[PDB]
Amino acid sequence: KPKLRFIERAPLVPKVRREPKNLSDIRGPSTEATEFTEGNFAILALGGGYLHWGHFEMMRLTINRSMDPKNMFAIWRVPAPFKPITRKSVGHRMGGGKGAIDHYVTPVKAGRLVVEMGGRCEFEEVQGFLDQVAHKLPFAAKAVSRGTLEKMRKDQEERERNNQNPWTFERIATANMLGIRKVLSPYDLTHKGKYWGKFYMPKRV
Amino acid sequence: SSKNLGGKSSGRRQGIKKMEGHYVHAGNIIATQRHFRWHPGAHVGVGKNKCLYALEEGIVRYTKEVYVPHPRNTEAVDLITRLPKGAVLYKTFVHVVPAKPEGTFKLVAML
Amino acid sequence: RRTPPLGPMPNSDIDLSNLERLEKYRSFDRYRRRAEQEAQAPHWWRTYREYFGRTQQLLERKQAIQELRANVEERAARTASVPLDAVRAEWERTCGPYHKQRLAEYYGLYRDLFH
Amino acid sequence: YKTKPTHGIGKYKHLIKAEVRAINLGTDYEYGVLNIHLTAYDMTLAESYAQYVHNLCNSLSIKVEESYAMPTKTIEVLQLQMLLDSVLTTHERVVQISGLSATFAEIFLEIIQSSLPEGVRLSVKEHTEED
Amino acid sequence: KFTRSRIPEKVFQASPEDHEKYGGDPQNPHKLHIVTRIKSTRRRPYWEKDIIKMLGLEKAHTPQVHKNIPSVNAKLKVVKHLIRIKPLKLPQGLPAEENMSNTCLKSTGELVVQWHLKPV
RNA sequence: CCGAGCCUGGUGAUAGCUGGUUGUCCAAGAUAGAAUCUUAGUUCAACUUUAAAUUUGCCCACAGAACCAAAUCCCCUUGUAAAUUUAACUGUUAGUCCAAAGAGGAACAGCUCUUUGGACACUAGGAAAAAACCUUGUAGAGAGAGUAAAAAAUUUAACACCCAUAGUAGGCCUAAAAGCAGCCACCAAUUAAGAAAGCGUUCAAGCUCAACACCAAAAAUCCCAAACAUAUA
RNA sequence: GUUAACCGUGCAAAGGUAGCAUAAUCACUUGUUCCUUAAAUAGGGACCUGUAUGAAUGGCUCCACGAGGGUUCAGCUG
RNA sequence: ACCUCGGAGCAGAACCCAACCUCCGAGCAGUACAUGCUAAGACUUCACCAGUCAAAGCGAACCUCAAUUGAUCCAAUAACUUGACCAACGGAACAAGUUACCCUAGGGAUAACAGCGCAAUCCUAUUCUAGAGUCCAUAUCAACAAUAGGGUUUACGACCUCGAUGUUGGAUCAGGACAUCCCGAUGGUGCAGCCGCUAUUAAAGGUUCGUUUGUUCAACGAUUAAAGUCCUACGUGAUCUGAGUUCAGACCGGAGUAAUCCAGGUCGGUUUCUAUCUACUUUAUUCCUCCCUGUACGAAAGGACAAGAGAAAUAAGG
RNA sequence: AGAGUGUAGCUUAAAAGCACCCAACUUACACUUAGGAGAUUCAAUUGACGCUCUGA
RNA sequence: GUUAAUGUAGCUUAAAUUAUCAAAGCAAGGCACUGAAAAUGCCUAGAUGAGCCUCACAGCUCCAUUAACACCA
Ligand SMILES: [Mg+2]
Ligand SMILES: [Mg+2]
Ligand SMILES: [Mg+2]
Ligand SMILES: [Mg+2]
Ligand SMILES: [Mg+2]
Ligand SMILES: [Mg+2]
Ligand SMILES: [Mg+2]
Ligand SMILES: [Mg+2]
Ligand SMILES: [Mg+2]
Ligand SMILES: [Mg+2]
Ligand SMILES: [Mg+2]
Ligand SMILES: [Mg+2]
Ligand SMILES: [Mg+2]
Ligand SMILES: [Mg+2]
Ligand SMILES: [Mg+2]
Ligand SMILES: [Mg+2]
Ligand SMILES: [Mg+2]
Ligand SMILES: [Mg+2]
Ligand SMILES: [Mg+2]
Ligand SMILES: [Mg+2]
Ligand SMILES: [Mg+2]
Ligand SMILES: [Mg+2]
Ligand SMILES: [Mg+2]
Ligand SMILES: [Mg+2]
Ligand SMILES: [Mg+2]
Ligand SMILES: [Mg+2]
Ligand SMILES: [Mg+2]
């Protein structure tokens, strides 16, 4: 049914064991749902980050207000918040074990499609309200069509052939030119030089 | 509060002691383990805590052989009888190729 | 790091989606027959074996068993003797020399006699 | 180098198995859990046909999952015709089935039909029962 | 963690364009290296501090010859950011026993065998 | 100067605590951990020192190491000159920051806790000043020379011009919804203007558009080098 | 349970009685109302969840008295 | 709350690896009675002590489980052996509270005050168009959020200082910030006027007196053009105060057998310094009155600006 | 009429191995144990019978 | 906020488990009606989510709710 369903905070099975904050759940490119499945229009993540339930009901209400339910349909490409964030009650000194579970987040890597759309208009009709959604997300994001995503991957690939600088990041980091791997990660090999922490730089070759 | 308590056990120091291609006298402990990782092969014994020792003075090699268990081993004969018919199991084994010939015939007298 | 296998990985032709439909060993001994076939294969990886390694004849035999199926009366089945000395003379003529070559190799005559 | 180009050489769990309707649209309905009920006034003849069914299914590689028995009926001469009394009893037994096609459906019924002995009744159905 | 880095062998395949920018050729390769240390070994790990002593490059900017065999190349591959490798090309032949006494290396790597101090 | 006087004596009480430890000259020298009424300490180990004995030690290649990522281990060659063992000991055993993989916390801290690797407590140059970043080490005299690292780059939002009459006061549904309160429909006169896309009606008119034609910064004593776009790397 | 004289029930050696009280008396509390002042977290008089008052651990008034601790009229005075 | 031992993660692939880190468990039960004796070689929980494995041989047959535990000395015993929840688990053979009457040795290795770091909490500005504002997002207020900032609060950290960095409020004198309370200038207004709201600009000048409270606060009285927000070692104690806080005395209630204790109350309680050096030690605002005028405005109630005149007061200098 | 050919079910088996069948255990199945059954379409690589094809 | 405890018929003790008695309430019952008396039956997810067993049951997960504590500068 062609609106977004209600994403509930805190799924009905609770998590009981407190997991560590792995922040490799934000780093680098996404290998999860990078592609369009039965839709044409989306919000591409251009940086990593966590989504609250607050960002979900941001994304749910400000689409359903500004979307014709007879000509458009939407679908989530992200799950419910499953990853539990542990917050100690304020005013206490350090020590005393891990705190309690406060809220749940869902991790979103960069390059992941967030909210897919589709229906009987062209991209300039949905570009308006999807951009104010993508701007309010807790990471840089972009309202992409099914054509612009290929016309940005076309542009990001010809950019890698055109550069007149002999030195790319791959040729230097993998071959360990300056002893430069002393100041890089082991993720700096296969990410590229593009990704840096949570942030993804689309300008950079 | 830290309700969790007890995990102060130290490391077991369990692993291969004599790696592949080593000369091993008869009785040296090739590996110590829990939860079988290397099974005994030719001239390799097993102790109570599943360690592997060498039964002859030789050179230790590691192969990948075919696993057929004992028909009294009831926890793993049912492991066989749910396999499809192309299947074999292929565990890994530790052998000792013995170096010294076990003796020579020598003149002791002229009688 | 992960490097690809050199030859055919085993158990690869049977890794099918329809697992429940497969023809499924139900006995120990059927597997022990298959598994002792694999320990004579080439095996690219590493093996213990590397370090430690007419027309009137069948026509007369056809009436032979048909004749011999009647004088056992199937009364000698549900405890016959099988005289060996006649059998031995039959063995020495026919499958003596094939068998005799084994012992001459197991005892290692040929690698001492004739190189 | 720990892993190797021989890694995964012994993996004994994707090969082995671990731990309604049959939807299958268009080709459609590939008959799922069906309880064929073998019922007789005898005991031996009912058992000898479940004997015949179960060996038939494994010969045709179509899956069976139960062979249990519905318990026994307790009726006399029903006193509907000096009023008569002698206890004649009925022995029912369940044979289940899980895999069937549309294209084996009418045929596999025939081998059950043609071989069905004297005084026994079948009844195919879906599943909502317990002993 | 910072570990002992390893180089893919794809880096040490020379292109035909590399045979244009540099004077060597794959057939008939040079026999000896000229290895001079141009970077200090401090602020670099102890394995690189120890390889430099094994090649014999305690002094920076001093020249040193090594064979071009794959074993000693496998020690130059770990300290290749500290050194300059040049092929020792001999314009004349090898120095004879009468011609050991007066040679010089002649950066551009040309071990001249009779080095006089007179103009041409 | 009384929570138990004062004096002499035991008494040079004792102090895992503090302070102090005096000629010259050179050489080697940075700390894995375990126990402990123990974490201000000590004992063993590790490391360091000296003197010996002997033979290999570092670097390492194919092969090799488990099922339920960077790498290490192993290891001949090879490059090199140490290494193990014996003897006699002390001291360190209250560490810091940087990069990397993580845990705790707020994906706070010049925060805390491990691991791998640097540097620092060791001189020198640079980053303004500077422990920890970068460059560099084995030592002297020189009124010589080549070098290394090494000086932040940016300045941005104008916009069409013109033209607008009719079914019709749209079946529907609503007091009333006539382009804009709501569904379905959305055909049609003129050459061309949507049963109307934004403003403006309780319902109506009006303004336009679509259509013809035309052609980024804020805080507390006083900003803070001076400056400078053009002679050849 | 009907704010409950009362009934129901448990426990106890006995269940704080007389008085007195927002006190020099945990906290809520600068409780509440009256008087005092133009204005009162002060003071004085009352009301009493004082749920941590209370009877020689002495309770409560009252005459004198105090370099005691609060408050006040008038006068006075840098 | 914990303290010894084992499994899993962190610690992904030899070993190792911390945490008042995340999770599970153990202080046995069962079967034997060759769970007999001896003995090459090895492993080892980073030491040691403890632990583990084991070929053969001799004698005979023909252990499972992960942890499942405890040293010396002393006991008990003819002997073999057996003795602690010695669990603070490498174990002193047997010992508690209290101290504000305190003392000594120390420590900025370690707290309170202050600085600094950080900004969760706070405070502000934008971006966003839901909702409010009759209608109308943007006169005004604003949710879900997003991006930057500030360093006033409560925190956190433990880097300087314990061979002393004196502390709350007030007095005295103020220095500065502008995110302006008043005075000035301007844009918008759901600005009719009087009054407001909001924003841009401005830090020259101004920012009252009282009752209760130890109070900064607040409440309240009367005012005023307004009674601003802060920083300055919560400015300033070698300038002052000591009422609070925080010594020894003491009651009251409470906790405790008592000593004594309580961020609970209350009476009382010594505030030293002769200045070496640095630094330093004489250069106009605002309100009200009258008038416009009872005008503009509204239509009425109400009621201004700008132009002019006249009085004052505070301040600086005499 | 033209064609592919041809080992019992199957077989880059050459008289083989699997499958298969009846009992005895099992609710049955499965396992196992005791048994049971069978093929080179026929004549000198040819020739000629069995099927499956392309025909009318 | 931390520990400490409690969890119940309509109300309350219980009973070391399988759950009672005594008011509640339901009616019948000594002849003018009610209270009292005494007497059938009636009134218990033993406050929760999981089943290792078997769980008021026994450890969690919990939710309520009660007492302690919420310092020393
Ligand atoms: Mg562990
Ligand atoms: Mg440990
Ligand atoms: Mg002394
Ligand atoms: Mg020295
Ligand atoms: Mg100490
Ligand atoms: Mg630190
Ligand atoms: Mg118009
Ligand atoms: Mg009180
Ligand atoms: Mg007074
Ligand atoms: Mg009394
Ligand atoms: Mg050891
Ligand atoms: Mg033995
Ligand atoms: Mg201990
Ligand atoms: Mg006192
Ligand atoms: Mg002292
Ligand atoms: Mg400190
Ligand atoms: Mg502080
Ligand atoms: Mg609204
Ligand atoms: Mg620290
Ligand atoms: Mg101090
Ligand atoms: Mg001093
Ligand atoms: Mg301003
Ligand atoms: Mg102060
Ligand atoms: Mg003073
Ligand atoms: Mg002062
Ligand atoms: Mg006095
Ligand atoms: Mg001075």
Distance from CA(A86) to C1'(H264), angstroms, rounded: 38
Domain that holds residue B70: 5-111
Domain that holds residue A44: 1-205
Residue B19 sits at the chain C interface (C-beta within 8 Å): no
CB E33 within 8 A of CB E86: yes
DSSP summary character for residue E106: T
How many distinct structural domains can be found in chain B? 1
CA of A120 to the centre of ligand 25 (A): 79
- Helices A123-135 and A54-64, axial angle in degrees (round to 10): 150
Please tell me the distance from the alpha carbon of residue C36 to that of residue C24, in angstroms, as a whole number.
18
Q: Given a contact as 3+ CB pairs under 8 Å, which chains touch E? A: A
Please tell me the distance from the alpha carbon of residue E92 to that of residue E69, in angstroms, as a whole number.
23
- Residue-wise burial string across A123-161, b where 16 or more C-beta atoms lie within 10 A, e elsewhere: bebbeebbeebbeebbbbbbbbbbebbeeeeeeeeeeee
Q: Give the strand order in the sheet containing A83-87.
A: A49-51, A100-108, A83-87
- Do B and D touch (≥3 CB pairs < 8 Å)? yes
Residue D78 sits at the chain C interface (C-beta within 8 Å): no
Please tell me the distance from the alpha carbon of residue D88 to that of residue D78, in angstroms, as a whole number.
9
Q: In Å, how far is C79's CA from the nearest CA of chain B?
A: 31
Q: Are residues C4 and D5, on separate chains, in Cβ contact within 8 Å?
A: yes
Nearest CA in chain D to C3: D5
- Torsion A44-A47-A53-A55 (CA) sign: negative
Kindly report the CA angle at D121 between D116 and D122, in degrees rounded to 5? 85
Q: List the beta bridge partners of residue E67.
A: E32
Q: Check whether residue A92 has its CB closer than 7 Å to nucleic acid strand J.
A: yes
Residue E111 CB contacts under 8 Å (≥ 6 apart), including other chains: E88, E89, E90, E91, E95, E103, E104, E105
E 18-37 → A contacts, CB under 8 A: none
Distance from CA(D92) to C1'(J11), angstroms, rounded: 57
Helices (H) and strands (E) in chain B, counts: 1, 7
CA of A125 to the centre of ligand 7 (A): 28
Q: Which helix (H) or strand (E) holds B74?
A: helix B74-80
Q: Which helix (H) or strand (E) holds B95?
A: strand B92-98
Q: Check whether residue B1 has its CB closer than 7 Å to nucleic acid strand J.
A: yes
Chain J positions with an atom below 7 A of a protein C-beta are: 1-3, 61-62
Entry resolution (Å) = 3.7
What is the three-state SS of chain A?
Answer: CCCCCCCCCCCCCCCCCCCCCCHHHCCCECCCCCCCCCCCEEEEECECEEECCHHHHHHHHHHHCCCCCCCEEEEECCCCCCEEEEECCCCCCCCCCCCEEEEEEEEECECCECEEEEECCCHHHHHHHHHHHHHCCCCCEEEECCCCCHHHHHHHHHHHHHCCCCCCHHHHHHCCCCCHHHCCCCCCCCCCCCEECCEECCCCC
CB E51 within 8 A of CB E74: no
Q: Which two tokens stand for residue B29?
A: 């402990």
Please tell me the distance from the alpha carbon of residue A105 to that of residue B105, in angstroms, as a whole number.
79
Please tell me the distance from the alpha carbon of residue E52 to that of residue E74, in angstroms, as a whole number.
13
- Do A and D touch (≥3 CB pairs < 8 Å)? no
Farthest-apart Cα atoms in chain E, separation: 58
Q: Which two tokens stand for residue A40?
A: 């044409």
CA of A75 to the centre of ligand 21 (A): 73
Domain that holds residue E41: 1-117
Please tell me the distance from the alpha carbon of residue B18 to that of residue E99, in angstroms, as a whole number.
54
Partner-chain residue, chosen from D3, D4, D15, that has the shortest CB–CB distance to C15: D15
Residue E24 CB contacts under 8 Å (≥ 6 apart), including other chains: E14, E30, E87
Chain F positions with an atom below 7 A of a protein C-beta are: 58-81, 99-109, 111-112, 115-119, 133-137, 146, 184
Q: In Å, how far is B2's CA from the nearest CA of chain D?
A: 35
Written as one string, the DSSP assignment of D47-68 is: HHHHHHHHHHHHHTT-------
Residue E76 CB contacts under 8 Å (≥ 6 apart), including other chains: E33, E35, E55, E66, E83, E85
CB A58 within 8 A of CB A139: no
Q: Which of D95, D105, D31, D99 shows the shortest CA–CA distance to D63?
A: D99
Q: Which of A184, A164, A159 shows the shortest CA–CA distance to A172?
A: A184
Task: Identify the three-state secondary structure at position D106.
Answer: helix
Q: Give the strand order in the sheet containing E83-87.
A: E65-67, E32-37, E83-87
The CATH number linked to B52 is 2.40.50.100
What determination technique applies here?
Answer: cryo-EM
- Cα distances from C2 to residues A161, D8, E8, in angstroms, run 29, 11, 14
Task: Identify the three-state secondary structure at position D100.
Answer: coil
How many distinct structural domains can be found in chain E? 1
CB D129 within 8 A of CB D35: yes
How many distinct structural domains can be found in chain A? 1
What is the three-state SS of chain C?
Answer: CCCCCCCCCCCCCCCCCCCCCCCCCCCHHHHHHHHHHHCCCCCCCCCHHHHHCCHHHHHHHHHHHHHHCCCCCCCCCCCCCCCHHHHHHHHHHHCHHHHHHHHHHHCCCHHHHCC
Q: Are residues E81 and A174, on separate chains, in Cβ contact within 8 Å?
A: no
Q: List the beta bridge partners of residue D95.
A: D36
DSSP summary character for residue E37: E
Please tell me the distance from the alpha carbon of residue E48 to that of residue E75, in angstroms, as a whole number.
9
Chain I positions with an atom below 7 A of a protein C-beta are: 15, 19-22, 27-32, 35-37, 40
User: How many C-alpha atoms does A77 have within 13 Å on its Cβ side?
Assistant: 24
Residue A149 CB contacts under 8 Å (≥ 6 apart), including other chains: A36, A42, A44
Q: In Å, how far is B104's CA from the nearest CA of chain D?
A: 40
